[PDB]
Amino acid sequence: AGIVRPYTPEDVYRLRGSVQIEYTLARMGAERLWNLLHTEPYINALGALTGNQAMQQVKAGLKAIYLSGWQVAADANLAGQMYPDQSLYPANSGPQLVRNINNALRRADQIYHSEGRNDIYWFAPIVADAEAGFGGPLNVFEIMKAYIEAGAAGVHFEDQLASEKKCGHMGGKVLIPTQAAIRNLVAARLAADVMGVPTIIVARTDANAATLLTSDIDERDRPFCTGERTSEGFYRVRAGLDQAIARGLAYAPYADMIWCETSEPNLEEARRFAEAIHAQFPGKLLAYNCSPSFNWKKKLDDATIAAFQRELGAMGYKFQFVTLAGFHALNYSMFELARNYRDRGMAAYSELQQAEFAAEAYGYTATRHQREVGTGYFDEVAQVIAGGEI
Amino acid sequence: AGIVRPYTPEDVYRLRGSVQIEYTLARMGAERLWNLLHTEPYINALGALTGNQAMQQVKAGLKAIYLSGWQVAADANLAGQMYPDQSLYPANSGPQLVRNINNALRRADQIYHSEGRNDIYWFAPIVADAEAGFGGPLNVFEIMKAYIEAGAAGVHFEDQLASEKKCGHMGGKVLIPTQAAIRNLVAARLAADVMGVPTIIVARTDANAATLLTSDIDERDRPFCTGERTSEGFYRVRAGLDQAIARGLAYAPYADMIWCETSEPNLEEARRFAEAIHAQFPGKLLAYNCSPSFNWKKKLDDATIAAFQRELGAMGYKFQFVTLAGFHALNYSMFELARNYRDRGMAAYSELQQAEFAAEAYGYTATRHQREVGTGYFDEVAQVIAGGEI
Amino acid sequence: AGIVRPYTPEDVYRLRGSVQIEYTLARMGAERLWNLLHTEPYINALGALTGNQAMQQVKAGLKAIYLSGWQVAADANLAGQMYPDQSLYPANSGPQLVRNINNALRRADQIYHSEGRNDIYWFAPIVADAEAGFGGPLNVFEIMKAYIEAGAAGVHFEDQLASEKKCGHMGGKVLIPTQAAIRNLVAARLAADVMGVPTIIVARTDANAATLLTSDIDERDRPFCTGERTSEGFYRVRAGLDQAIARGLAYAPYADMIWCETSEPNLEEARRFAEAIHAQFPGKLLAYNCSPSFNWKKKLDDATIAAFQRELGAMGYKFQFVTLAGFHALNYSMFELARNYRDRGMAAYSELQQAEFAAEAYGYTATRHQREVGTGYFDEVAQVIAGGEI
Amino acid sequence: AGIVRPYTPEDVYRLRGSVQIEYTLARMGAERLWNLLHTEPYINALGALTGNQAMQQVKAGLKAIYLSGWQVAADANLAGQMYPDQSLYPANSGPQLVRNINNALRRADQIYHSEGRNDIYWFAPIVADAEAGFGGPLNVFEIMKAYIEAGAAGVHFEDQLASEKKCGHMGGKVLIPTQAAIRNLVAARLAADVMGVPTIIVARTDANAATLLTSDIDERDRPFCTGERTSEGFYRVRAGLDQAIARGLAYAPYADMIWCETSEPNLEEARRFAEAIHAQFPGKLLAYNCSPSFNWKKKLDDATIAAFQRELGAMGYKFQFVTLAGFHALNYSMFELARNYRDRGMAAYSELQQAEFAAEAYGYTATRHQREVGTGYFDEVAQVIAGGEI
């Protein structure tokens, strides 16, 4: 409400088989995510690419987890390859990682519970990158169901061509027609309705920077056409906020939350986009990529950097995420330790250990690595198994 | 030389099939590891649990990579679970991770090569944890071959019971008989000879702290027996450096390098162990776990912490590794960023970005994440594919 | 009732975390399996090693599916290796295959449902081989939970040593002490209680043929000891029906159903075992391996072969399974087609096609391969997605 | 020779990194496949979807193995789902299965070798389905390298749209422009040259039945255009042998072997296609799908069915394959056994066992299942490990 479903309950009933399988984590996740998005000033989250990263995010009091397809491409995909962000990896990598994260969170819940603690809420909703769906609408249908099986709370889909898909901050992005992008959003809602789960659907547009379109088939896209075509037969279009706004407005009836990929953290741009959407869709949830490909200190003065998320929240950007935080934290911390260890050996490692001891003041516990991974929990299991007679 | 093989070339020929498959990375790795161990004062390395961690280790000038089974248990296993260090995860997890790491290193090599750079040697040898072999000698045979397939340079095996196996710093460790541990080392050399690769074999003993033994079957273990037995029927033994030394000496003919698990970074202990081994096996390679479960600054003054690895090198500890560096770096860096992001949003993230920019002075490049993951490399691929006519 | 749990509800509550995840297929499976076992003369099933084998078993009217660890070892494990039956493969292979099978059954249910048919009940309970648990009781705890996650209805555990474990029809089998085997059965019930699912637990004994024991620790096993020990330090025991009966009776309080591995399909032996169990445990469910390693026509005359399962049912063997049916059907059918195709090309293939057309008389539909795999179902999905306007 | 590469050795050198990894099975496979295709009247093969199916194919004297993407979709993909043939599964499924098959063949080689037999040549070349490449040319580049890593000898690529891709015998197939299909073939040769392996490349066209085209961009495709466009904006084209022939001729410089998907086993059609290709490309290798979706006995009289492959060989169809033999053999054999087992229990199973005993006359050995899976081989391994003193 007011979401459009261009199909009937009977359509859903015919396609869902005779038995309904319960997806507890996906149901909890979507419920909690939807409450949070309507009750908080905003939700801020960071990219996680391992169960331990996502565990520390929750442990530090973040209320949501972001699963980045870019990070999956780089360091956590089922091909075990390092890829750039071009949908090169196996389409089940993302859902598999969402499962691993929920497994880590479930183990944390088990540790804290076995010690009589409930001070951390471990089951933070996961919002997951489905890219451009790894082909057509049936591929979208499958990745959506896989994410619900894995326990994702929300899933995002973008209007780039899957076969030539790119990082949101790479040149030469290719839009698919408006009607094709809406068909993907309908495929995603159909997958959620078939699984019987109120999963959040985020519609991303790449139309802010995208200067190429696959097909002139859709009347709604032709106004942006220049009349040039390329060797490949792509149509040249006028990228910018007018194209982004068009797509945003076309997708709003079919998605819970709208996201404009941005080439620069610009609050005036953000406000103009927000006001354009809310003019036709009052109160529509928006999402904002706080991109690590932005040089925050070079673009913004300290006051704006500190105010940025709060300002974005007041405009309607209720979900704000640093997509590549996990990559940067992982690569930075190992490089820095490695570079110092090369020269100074155990002095370099003692420096990290001392940083860990300092963070214990703020609830960090992984310095005590044996307890952190569940050694205490499995020792309680062993003792129950060994405990009673015969 | 002087390694003992209690079997013949004919035995190997009968078991190796009719075709010999080449394992380039495993052959390069074992060759380079063996040269390094004989030409350098020592090799120091850190635990890596992702391809990106291992890439930053090489990029910072570390000459070897350590694959920790503990880290696999925690955050990088094929069950996608968080486990403590009790051989709970699927036995192919470790070799799979070694493949992923070599894949990341291979992609780095491809990036640097496509830019006309050869200043980094990317194929750093990987020394991998095979635990207690995930069952009997045939399980040892399989994990050894899997590691060679994955491109490991060296593999370590310990004399704990696989079914009750534990972290080297957990209480209640259980030794298997000397003869059983030697049989595992023979299984590992047989696997390497069958694959036709000079893979390094490390024999770890847990006999420094282990107070329990499965069986009195071996004459060599009975001197350590007290005569007590437990409910489970384990034999109580006198743990300590005399037990560790016995096992070390029993394993030396069957392993390239010897490793005594230690409960404390103690140079006098280290020297006594080294001198005990070299008294019968002059020049025998040793390995030393620089354990993160040690409180380095609480146990050692700054001069000893700074000298520690250099001193250990001079005694014969030519391979020194911080087993859980990857876990600590990953958990610490995401907690710290998360805790600050919770309060201060993009100020917290700009602080990490600024740390990344500072590390560029020392060769860090992942701040430029697009190039780091191979966007330039795959854009050269796309251009060759698109480049010529028809 | 009367099952023994040597632990409390409070023990279970402490170990199960704060949220209870629903396992619909595992709950349905255990419920349906338990009803069937108490209402039918008996249940007969065949080994399945692919989703399609299990689909044809259900389609032909078999009421249960058997997941063989032997078949997993041969042709369906996560190492992608051909293994003999010695617990050589990754411990998650079995549960993964149970998931794949339930996925195939779920797709069948979706096809038949989308066509307005409910004449096949697709969700046949799966009884799965957990071997000797892939190590100790904690490994048992993990494989039990993995099977419940995958949707198994029942799981079996045997009293062989995991590290030297063997095919039930291989020589030199090694029993673990009675107390150790009971501890594994307690670990399995604890895993099921923690997941909140009434999963069936089958206790297999290998004590009919097993002539070796790991430890004299248990008073209950010493009567079978000869007083000889081997090089490895195994104890020699008197294998036979008296040892099998002892173990069966020791395991009965801790398992729902008892299974004696047999070296020969002998109804008098079967009756003696049944009568021995029911003398202390009236009405106890039993299970019987109708082994394909038996030469049925060489051992039994036609009347006995035809009566065999019915006779076994009347004794209390309510679950009867041909463990390796899937292996034999798969290897036989491809060899036979291949051998004829080598000589006669498409004549050989037309002969198979004609056999398929003949089986359509009995409900076979896979000749129509396009519909069989869900082409119709996904074409209905595509049409709902494409169907409504904008 | 005369293959066109629209790129230079320098292009390949820049993209291949600094170290060349050996792919023994892929090199052997491509070499043996290329010799066979030039020395034999023709090669006939069957679809295999497990290592055991492929082992029985080799054991029966077939000289090649076919890896079907359709069969992967149905019963052997990394999503563990039953899919129709629409590129729905994870793109690494096919290469993973090629690895499993080579693993089974390697184990067979090890068994026969350990017994002093070399009468079977186990390393039969595998020709593998890469579909339409699971996206764009970079996705093609990755699946080609993955197949070479897995040890495929040859790989096929078709000119259908990946996102709307379909079974070769499904209606509503969509061609991509000629230039796009050639770009995929260039991506595949670039991947093989980068890996340093002479892998066979097969170009399939779907233009015999395909009535839709994505784009009018290519001058070579416009002659087939009617001038109608659909809702989706696809161009209507005149399907048939003239379109198939055009594509075949466009692809011939860029592929080793050409394949026209056919809706019917018609020798006159086959001859016309062959003669059309050889008129411009004398001696060009062709491949022919002997489709199981054809009703062989309904379409052809017994003489033609028996002569069919021999006739096709003489025209230039040197590689002939029944794509779905594995699916039909697996589904048929389990249904038939299941249906009989439901009624007659062990009589039904004894009937299969008796069929197995009869096939032993022609070299079938899987009735002796213990030896078949390597129990003898691993018992020789155990004995070498246990054999020598200390």
UniProtKB/TrEMBL annotation, chains A, B, C, D:
Q: Does the keyword Transferase apply?
A: no
InterPro entries according to UniProt: ICL/PEPM, Isocitrate_lyase, Isocitrate_lyase_ph_CS, Pyrv/PenolPyrv_kinase-like_dom, Pyrv_kinase-like_dom_sf
Pathway of this protein? Carbohydrate metabolism; glyoxylate cycle; (S)-malate from isocitrate: step 1/2
Give binding positions for Mg(2+). Answer: 129
MF terms per GO, please?
isocitrate lyase activity; metal ion binding
NCBIfam families in alphabetical order: isocit_lyase, PRK15063.1
Protein name according to UniProt: Isocitrate lyase
Organism of provenance:
Chloroflexus aurantiacus (strain ATCC 29366 / DSM 635 / J-10-fl)
